[PDB]
Amino acid sequence: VSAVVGMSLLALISIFASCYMLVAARSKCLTPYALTPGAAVPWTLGILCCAP
Amino acid sequence: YEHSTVMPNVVGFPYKAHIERPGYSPLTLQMQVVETSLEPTLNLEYITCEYKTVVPSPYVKCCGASECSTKEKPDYQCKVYTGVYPFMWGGAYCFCDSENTQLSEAYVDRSDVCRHDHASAYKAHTASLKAKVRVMYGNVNQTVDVYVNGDHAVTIGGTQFIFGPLSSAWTPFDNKIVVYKDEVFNQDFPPYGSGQPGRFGDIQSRTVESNDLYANTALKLARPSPGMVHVPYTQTPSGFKYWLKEKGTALNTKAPFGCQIKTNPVRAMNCAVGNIPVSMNLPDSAFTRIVEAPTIIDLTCTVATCTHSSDFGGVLTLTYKTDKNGDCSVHSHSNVATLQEATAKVKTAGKVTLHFSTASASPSFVVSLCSARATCSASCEPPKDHIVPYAASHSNVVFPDMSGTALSWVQKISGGLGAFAIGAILVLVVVTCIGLRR
Numbered sequence: 001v002s003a004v005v006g007m008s009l010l011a012l013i014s015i016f017a018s019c020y021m022l023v024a025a026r027s028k029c030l031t032p033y034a035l036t037p038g039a040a041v042p043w044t045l046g047i048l049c050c051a052p
Numbered sequence: 053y054e055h056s057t058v059m060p061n062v063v064g065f066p067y068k069a070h071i072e073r074p075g076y077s078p079l080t081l082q083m084q085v086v087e088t089s090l091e092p093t094l095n096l097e098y099i100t101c102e103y104k105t106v107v108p109s110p111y112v113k114c115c116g117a118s119e120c121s122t123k124e125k126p127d128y129q130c131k132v133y134t135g136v137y138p139f140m141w142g143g144a145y146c147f148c149d150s151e152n153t154q155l156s157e158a159y160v161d162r163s164d165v166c167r168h169d170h171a172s173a174y175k176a177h178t179a180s181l182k183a184k185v186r187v188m189y190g191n192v193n194q195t196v197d198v199y200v201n202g203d204h205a206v207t208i209g210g211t212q213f214i215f216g217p218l219s220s221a222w223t224p225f226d227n228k229i230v231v232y233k234d235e236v237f238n239q240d241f242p243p244y245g246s247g248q249p250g251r252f253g254d255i256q257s258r259t260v261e262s263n264d265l266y267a268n269t270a271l272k273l274a275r276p277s278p279g280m281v282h283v284p285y286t287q288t289p290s291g292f293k294y295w296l297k298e299k300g301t302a303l304n305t306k307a308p309f310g311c312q313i314k315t316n317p318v319r320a321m322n323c324a325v326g327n328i329p330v331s332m333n334l335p336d337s338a339f340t341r342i343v344e345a346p347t348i349i350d351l352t353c354t355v356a357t358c359t360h361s362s363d364f365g366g367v368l369t370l371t372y373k374t375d376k377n378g379d380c381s382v383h384s385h386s387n388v389a390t391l392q393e394a395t396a397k398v399k400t401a402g403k404v405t406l407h408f409s410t411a412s413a414s415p416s417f418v419v420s421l422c423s424a425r426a427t428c429s430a431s432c433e434p435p436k437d438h439i440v441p442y443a444a445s446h447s448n449v450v451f452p453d454m455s456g457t458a459l460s461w462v463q464k465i466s467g468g469l470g471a472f473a474i475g476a477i478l479v480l481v482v483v484t485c486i487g488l489r490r
């Protein structure tokens with residue numbers, strides 16, 4: 001039971017960390033276009049990453 | 053050749069020893085222990101046995117007075133009483149109505165069966181160990197008695213064996229013990245000369261033949277009843293009988309490790325604990341040269357069936373090719389599984405079968421047939437029987453091999469998670485690099 005719970009927590013923290021880091025990477029990639037007055041994101045980056 | 057090995061201290065468990073010298077065929081020694089005796093050094097300090105009270109006939113003096121002097125006897129009690137009128141079957145004993153005196157005295161001395169029935173007390177010390185070991189190899193098969201202390205060297209078949217010292221210094225006997233007939237107890241006892249009435253140690257003696265004795269039993273005298281001749285005395289009963297009534301729980305039914313305790317001399321047997329180092333010096337005549345030994349090439353192993361249990365319920369088959377028939381030495385290089393046979397019968401057919409015992413879900417081990425070496429992996433099924441009367445015949449290991457099913461599942465799950473993490477970190481790195489280039 002200890003081994004099962006330990007493996008489950010390790011897997012959960014791994015997947016959560018990977019997802020959070022991917023989301024942070026997307027945010028850091030798409031931040032500058034939101035700060036530029038006017039203009040717009042290209043549809044390629046808007047399809048690869050969900051752009052509002 | 054000087055070689056060293058460690059053997060687990062379990063009675064009845066066979067042990068396989070491998071000897072490899074370059075230029076000669078490997079040799080396997082079958083070693084076993086048949087009985088182990090653990091004896092401590094004892095120094096007697098006293099014994100105890102039931103006592104008796106000696107009281108002589110009272111002295112009656114008519115028309116006079118008496119006065120008794122003290123003597124050197126254990127718990128000697130004497131007293132003089134005035135104003136007595138003794139009576140007998142005929143009539144009065146003296147004319148004097150109220151000028152008679154009676155002297156009474158009593159003491160205590162060890163019983164006449166103290167030599168045959170007694171309980172001794174002992175102080176424990178460091179304990180030495182003696183064992184009996186059966187050794188077989190080749191045409192030699194013999195049992196020898198050894199002192200496991202690192203000193204007693206035994207020569208069997210022109211071969212020198214040295215044993216011990218034991219790796220754990222553990223004894224079941226506490227500092228103070230009490231021995232009675234066939235029973236030993238780890239109960240403390242009062243020191244010499246400080247016994248108390250009604251309990252253990254009321255009567256004390258240095259040895260069975262000692263002439264001195266220490267007694268403390270609260271022997272009290274009383275005044276005789278009028279018109280009678282007798283001596284009234286009150287005394288607490290013997291503490292030895294009370295102790296025999298309520299001695300407690302014996303060590304024979306309480307000792308750990310299943311040690312069998314026996315007396316005369318006080319010792320314990322079959323104490324399964326620790327392990328013994330052994331060192332052997334072998335002659336060259338007992339081995340075989342290579343060019344007389346068959347050469348094995350392209351050795352491949354497989355498993356027929358496996359059911360882990362205390363028995364030998366596992367069989368495997370080995371495939372080979374040689375140049376001449378003969379006898380080879382077979383061994384397993386891991387304690388995960390244990391083989392049964394030490395010598396293998398090699399022939400031109402190229403197929404042999406072996407038995408083994410194991411306790412893991414999926415064992416993997418390296419087998420060696422003469423000079424050739426191969427690997428064996430298997431999957432085993434649990435047994436159905438619950439209770440068996442024979443002891444386990446394998447080392448206790450349960451950790452599965454890295455290639456087992458469960459560990460394989462863990463492995464691909466971990467690999468997938470690691471691949472996902474590597475992809476994520478690579479994506480973050482490239483994003484941050486292209487960001488910083490700006």
Ligand SMILES: *[C@@H]1O[C@H](CO)[C@@H](O[C@@H]2O[C@H](CO)[C@@H](O)[C@H](O)[C@H]2NC(C)=O)[C@H](O)[C@H]1NC(C)=O
Nearest residue numbers: 113114115116117145146147148149150151152
């Ligand atoms: C015979 O009996 C008389 C008493 O009837 C004893 O005399 C007593 O002796 C003691 C010893 O000194 C005296 O204290 C008493 O006063 C005596 N009694 C009388 C009545 O005189 C005498 O000793 C006895 N003799 C023998 C040989 O037993």
Ligand SMILES: *[C@@H]1O[C@H](CO)[C@@H](O)[C@H](O)[C@H]1NC(C)=O
Nearest residue numbers: 082186187188192193194195
């Ligand atoms: C070794 O000798 C003992 C003594 O008779 C015997 O019981 C035992 O079976 C022998 N071992 C073998 C392998 O023959």
